[PDB]
Design a protein around this ligand. Structure first.
Ligand SMILES: O=C(Nc1ccc(OC(F)(F)F)cc1)N1CCC(Cc2cnc3ccccc3c2)CC1
Length: 336
């Protein structure tokens, strides 16, 4: 089988829509070679897309897995409700359960794979729905404990803490949504997000000030995306209603919301415990989420697998041939 990465609107996959929990959920369906072992749900992050697994989906299809990878809430052909409560990691965990059970049955079981914000989803979905996650893994994103207190992110960086998150302030703010609308800003925006730099090495994104709008006129075509996926990321992001990034940025506007759900579970609900197999693929140059943040991840697992790729936050495509190698071998022994 052709195990190369997925090309834009690749014929080796199905582009299907399925209504779940009130919204339309676009997804890609990558189907196995021969009789499937399992079904795998792949979850991207910000500002990624189901297409962000181009190196993984065909590889997992070639391993005999049925692969579904949905565009999440706010991204591409999936709906973006106005309700902030729909972008909480809980409700979206409830989404992934319904989309899974839409494919393997209510008693079925799934190998869950997420990354970035989707990396935080698949742990939540493994926490909320352990009836279903036979094996869960996350790339770049390590487990964060259930939130017990809510602090506005402004107050946390005002005391010098969590400065690696100071970009969500502006992101959650009106700036990125108001300034990046239409194919033209989105295109330059994606040059920025995927490693673009300007004539004097200005970066379109930094973890402290987020999107830099003054550089994005000057920023070149990206090292981690050819022209056709950059134009595929923009053709697909234009699917959302202007301002097209309300949904994609909405994943950052739910700090207090997720707090209320997890303060509930940190006090009443069960503790953060994973008794199903788990892989964690850290990316070395993930300037967004450093591999030190993984820290005391392992004290929450019966059987956790550690891994690390010398790569940026965009580990699915940069280190894709090394990531596919890592997930495959872990999947092979985790399921036996
Ligand atoms: O913003 C994120 N990723 C990202 C950042 C910058 C990017 O631009 C580029 F990297 F390309 F330059 C691209 C993606 N997140 C991904 C992981 C989420 C999981 C999470 C949730 N809550 C937490 C609460 C307390 C402690 C840790 C927590 C971690 C956070 C947001």
């Amino acid at each position: 089988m052709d195990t190369s990465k997925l090309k834009p609107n690749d014929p080796r996959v199905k582009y299907e829509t399925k209504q779940i929990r009130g919204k339309t959920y676009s997804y890609i369906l990558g189907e196995p070679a021969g009789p499937k072992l399992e079904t795998v749900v792949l979850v991207h992050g910000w500002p990624d897309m189901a297409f962000g697994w181009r190196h993984q989906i065909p590889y997992l299809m070639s391993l005999g897995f049925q692969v579904v990878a949905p565009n999440m809430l706010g991204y591409a052909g999936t709906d973006a409700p106005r309700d902030l409560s729909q972008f909480t990691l809980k409700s979206v965990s409830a989404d992934i359960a319904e989309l899974a059970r839409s494919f393997v049955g209510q008693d079925g079981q799934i190998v869950l794979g997420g990354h970035d914000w989707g990396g935080a989803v698949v742990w939540r979905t493994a926490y909320y729905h352990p009836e279903l996650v036979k094996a869960v893994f996350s790339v770049c994103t390590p487990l964060h404990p259930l939130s017990a207190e809510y602090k506005p992110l402004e107050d946390i960086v005002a005391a010098g803490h969590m400065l690696n998150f100071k970009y969500q302030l502006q992101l959650k703010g009106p700036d990125v949504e108001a300034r990046i609308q239409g194919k033209d800003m989105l295109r330059r925006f994606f040059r920025a997000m995927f490693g673009g730099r300007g004539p004097n090495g200005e970066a379109g994104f930094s973890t402290s000030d987020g999107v830099h709008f003054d550089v994005l006129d000057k920023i070149g075509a990206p090292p981690l995306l050819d022209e056709q996926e950059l134009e595929y990321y923009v053709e697909q992001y234009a699917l959302q209603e202007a301002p097209e990034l309300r949904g994609p940025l909405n994943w950052y506007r739910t700090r207090e919301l997720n707090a209320k759900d997890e303060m509930d579970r940190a006090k009443n609900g069960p503790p953060l415990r994973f008794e199903m197999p788990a892989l964690f693929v850290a990316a070395s140059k993930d300037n967004a989420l450093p591999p030190a943040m993984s820290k005391g991840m392992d004290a929450f697992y019966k059987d956790l697998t550690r891994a690390e790729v010398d790569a940026t936050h965009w580990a699915l495509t940069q280190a894709g041939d090394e990531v596919n190698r890592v997930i495959g071998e872990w999947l092979n022994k985790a399921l036996g």
